């Protein structure tokens, strides 16, 4: 039946489907065919499927997080010691239900956690997340003094896309190169960031350049913020400054070429330390300091 095919199925749509939620849905669909009553025939197979997915991954992190969350949920489910049928049914229900929940979470975020930008606070946004964009658009909807500063993102010209998205909303914007980012911290009030995943230590797994930005923020004492939908907690520990389980090469020194072929192999994923975060905006309450770790502990009971 395949999960990979399902994942492929969504390409041009997205922009509200929280990829991880889609993945979860796919998993649920895979499950509800081959009888979820038996644990011997099913859980192992699910694990195998997840492994296969991991193997097949081009450049994605949150899938693993989603799958482990799903597993945890499943584990939680069969603690009621009632009957196998009803519980199974409930589990089945909880896939589409989970998807439904995401929208509600988003709504909650966009109505409650938008009070940071009010008195014409100039925002420096980097790292594309849907939640942040929703917050922005729904702030425009609410009508508030606000200004935007865009740092140029270059994986495959995503900055331009971001700019275009901003345009279809009505709001003056300017482009800043991430080299002259050190020069402009004066008029810009606060730094906001969209993350790919949140680490066990507390730090942020992100894109082409974030650590430097964080450092700059620290230097300037202008606070650093991360806004994400609360399901990006992966069992991963970046122990050193330049280490992550990455699909791409970690700083590969290419041999002496002549025709200019091997050059664009720069770090497309960067990590920042735990101390840099001032506020983390999530749907499960306004929590930051060591909240992710606590959540993880609660999940693993260790």
């Amino acid at each position: 039946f395949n999960i990979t095919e399902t994942y492929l199925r969504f390409l041009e749509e997205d922009t509200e489907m929280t990829m991880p939620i889609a993945a979860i849905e796919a998993l649920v669909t895979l499950l509800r065919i081959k009888t979820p009553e038996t644990a011997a025939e099913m859980i192992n197979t699910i694990k195998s499927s997840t492994e296969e997915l991991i193997k097949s991954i081009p450049n994605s992190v949150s899938l693993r997080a989603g799958c482990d969350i799903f597993m945890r949920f499943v584990l939680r489910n069969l603690h009621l010691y009632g009957d196998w049928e009803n519980c199974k049914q409930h589990l089945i229900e909880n896939g589409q239900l989970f998807v439904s929940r995401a929208k509600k979470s988003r709504n909650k975020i966009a109505e409650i956690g938008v009070d940071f930008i009010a008195d014409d606070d100039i925002i420096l946004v980097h790292g594309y997340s849907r939640a942040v964009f929703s917050l922005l658009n729904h702030a425009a909807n609410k009508f508030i003094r606000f200004r935007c500063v865009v740092t140029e993102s270059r994986p495959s010209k995503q900055g331009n896309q971001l700019y275009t998205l901003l345009e279809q909303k009505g709001i003056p914007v300017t482009l800043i190169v991430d080299s002259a980012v050190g020069a402009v911290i004066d008029k810009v009030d606060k730094v906001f960031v969209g993350a790919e995943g949140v680490a066990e230590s507390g730090g942020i797994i992100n894109l082409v350049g974030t650590y430097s930005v964080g450092v700059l923020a620290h230097n300037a004492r202008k606070p650093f913020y991360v806004v994400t939908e609360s399901h990006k907690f992966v069992r991963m520990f970046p122990l050193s400054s330049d280490d992550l389980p990455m699909a791409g090469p970690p700083l590969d020194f290419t041999r002496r070429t002549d025709d200019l072929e091997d050059a664009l192999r720069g770090p497309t994923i960067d990590y920042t330390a735990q101390e840099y975060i001032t506020a983390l905006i999530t749907d499960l309450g306004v929590l930051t300091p060591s909240a992710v770790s606590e959540e993880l502990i609660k999940m693993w009971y260790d």
Partner: protein, 355 residues
């Protein structure tokens, strides 16, 4: 009754709160004490090998031995003077060398056990089950935990490594040994030594006994050793309710150095070492020893040279004091390897309320 007063050397002006004095050579004591405790105390007082991890285990073993040897009196019940005996033992230990957090925990556990079984059961049936239970506990919360930690470390280590290490922490020795033997990677071990206890030297010896490529350095020689070298590992004693690293001597400086030169530090700890006691400096409660450790002029421990120094009491206004336990900064260590695989040091008491 024991022995009181008479302390060698100057008392100094600063850092006066904890015991630093005492019985080194025994003279007149109570005629009821089991000698194994005394022997242990004698060992601990003049020890150069132990470092946080094995001490508690040793204590547990001693307790087990005592239990095995224990015989209930015909008149009084199993717990009547036993508590008094325990108290006396504790007092002796304190006199010799101050109690650790692990030791405190062990004591608490013992107390709990005592409360659990009320005086009604016969002798040979109760202690048979007690000793087994204690053994089981030991197997569970210590050795298995250590194994788990080791395995976690195993997956965490990448390819091509150059590591700087410190301490007589048994876990670290186990780790390094494991790396050397069963992993068969490109591991390089650099050792740092300290003046109060020759821990670094011991570590080096252990490495040699396995057959590892070893560089040997000190606290002073650090500016040239970096000039390729990445990982830094330290041995922790206990983590407090604040989250600060309450460990041995030369760690904090090393950590600071690591922080300065790009690459962060990783520290290992057990899931029982956590404390409810609140302190944020070394001044609060510190392991202070006699200035006899800082007498020998380099090279080796047993040399005894008549060089320049060899007086403390006769010298007018001279304070020669050294500290053993230190409080390292919170933000500097990033990695903590506990019972729950991986986590940050800012968690502090997440396992304390969990028990």
């Amino acid at each position: 009754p024991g022995i009181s007063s008479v302390i060698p050397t100057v008392l100094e002006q600063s850092f006066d709160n904890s015991s630093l004095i005492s019985v080194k050579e025994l003279l007149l004591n109570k005629d009821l004490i089991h000698p194994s405790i005394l022997l242990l105390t004698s060992h601990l007082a003049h020890y150069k090998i132990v470092g946080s991890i094995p001490r508690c285990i040793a204590m547990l073993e001693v307790f087990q031995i005592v239990i095995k040897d224990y015989q209930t009196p015909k008149g009084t019940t199993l717990s009547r003077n036993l508590t008094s005996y325990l108290s006396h033992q504790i007092d002796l230990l304190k006199k010799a060398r101050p109690l650790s957090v692990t030791m405190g925990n062990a004591i608490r556990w013992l107390k709990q056990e005592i409360s659990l079984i009320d005086p009604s059961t016969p002798d040979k049936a109760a202690k048979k089950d007690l000793c087994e239970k204690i053994g089981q506990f030991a197997k569970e919360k210590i050795e298995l935990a250590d194994q788990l930690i080791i395995d976690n470390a195993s997956t965490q280590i990448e390819e091509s490594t150059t590591i700087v290490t410190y301490g007589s922490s048994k876990v670290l020795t186990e780790l390094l040994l494991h790396n050397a033997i069963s992993l068969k990677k490109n591991i390089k071990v650099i050792v740092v030594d300290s003046r109060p206890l020759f821990e670094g030297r011991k570590m080096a010896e252990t490495l040699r006994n396995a057959g590892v490529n070893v560089m040997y350095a000190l606290i002073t020689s650090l500016d040239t050793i970096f000039n390729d070298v990445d990982y830094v590992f330290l041995g922790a004693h206990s983590i407090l309710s604040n989250g600060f690293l309450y460990s041995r001597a030369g760690t904090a400086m090393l950590a600071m150095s690591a922080k300065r030169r790009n690459i962060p530090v990783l520290v290992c700890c057990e899931s029982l070492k956590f404390s409810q006691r609140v302190q944020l400096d070394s001044v609060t409660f510190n392991e202070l020893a006699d200035p006899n450790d800082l007498v020998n002029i380099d090279y080796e421990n047993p040399v005894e040279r008549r060089g320049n120094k060899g007086a403390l009491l006769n010298q007018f206004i001279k304070e020669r004091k050294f500290e053993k336990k230190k409080l390292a900064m919170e933000n500097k260590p990033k990695g903590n390897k506990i019972g729950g695989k991986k986590g940050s040091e800012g968690e502090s008491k997440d396992a304390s309320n969990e028990e």
